[PDB]
Write a protein that binds this ligand. Sequence first.
Ligand SMILES: CNC(=O)c1cc(Oc2ccc(NC(=O)Nc3ccc(Cl)c(C(F)(F)F)c3)cc2)ccn1
Length: 305
Amino acid sequence: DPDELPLDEHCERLPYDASKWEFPRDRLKLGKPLGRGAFGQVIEADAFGIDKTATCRTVAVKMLKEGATHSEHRALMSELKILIHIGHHLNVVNLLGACTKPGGPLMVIVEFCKFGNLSTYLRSKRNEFVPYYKDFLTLEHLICYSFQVAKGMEFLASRKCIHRDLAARNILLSEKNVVKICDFGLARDIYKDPDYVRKGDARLPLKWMAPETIFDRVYTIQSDVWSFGVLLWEIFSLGASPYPGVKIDEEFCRRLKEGTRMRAPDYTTPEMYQTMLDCWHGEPSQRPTFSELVEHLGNLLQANA
Ligand SMILES: CNC(=O)c1cc(Oc2ccc(NC(=O)Nc3ccc(Cl)c(C(F)(F)F)c3)cc2)ccn1
């Protein structure tokens, strides 16, 4: 049903309103790289007056790199188009502008998120965590981050988009404990990153993928719910790697379809662990929706206080 169909499958027909989004290249001061893949990269920049008149703003710019071809260039343009269609939400990395004019590289300019990816950040805070000390993480923070990602994903779903690589490495942490969903995409070196496992010609985030995705190449909002459950485990393990000590092979995939699930992580509550189990239902339609996750996590956040 084309009304169920994720926008992004048909990105090429979406509009690029240059009068709204185009940002002069001479108003962008490029700085240090923030991430590089084989074909893409993100670099830090200072943008003069991109979102507020005459004010310097630190931003992140996604662009291509040596190795990329015309097809990566097309892909980045369609990424720009989907970000415009999606629009602004607190809990999604916000598009600020683009440089698309001939003579320079295509640049997709988004907000800079001070503390980087959530996995790395949580893993740095094992010694600065208490369940209930300024700058210490607490159980409240962790539940709050969970709630925030569910809000951003509910928003993504409302825009008829799905994620396909939802994981703590694709959550950014800003000031004031705001987390933002992103997708590094081409700016991540998936061939060097052990989170992506060779499967055919592709390198795939198998530990985050729902059984229907692994076996039938089916991507839906409900397979995103499965990944959200894995993200929850990452949050409540303070950034540990999923399925610890487990070879990700055909027998891993088999046991998963059979019903094997991860054990509770070190910092979880019982109801957070049950929520992970819910997200990991074998049948996609029996998983909670993001709207249901929002309501439930909102209740947990309230109960925690
Ligand atoms: C220390 N701080 C940093 O290193 C840092 C690095 C950044 O790098 C990035 C720059 C741009 C992006 N681009 C997206 O995210 N593109 C995207 C595409 C589809 C869809 Cl669907 C989505 C969505 F909606 F899921 F969000 C997002 C990702 C990361 C940003 C901020 N800070």
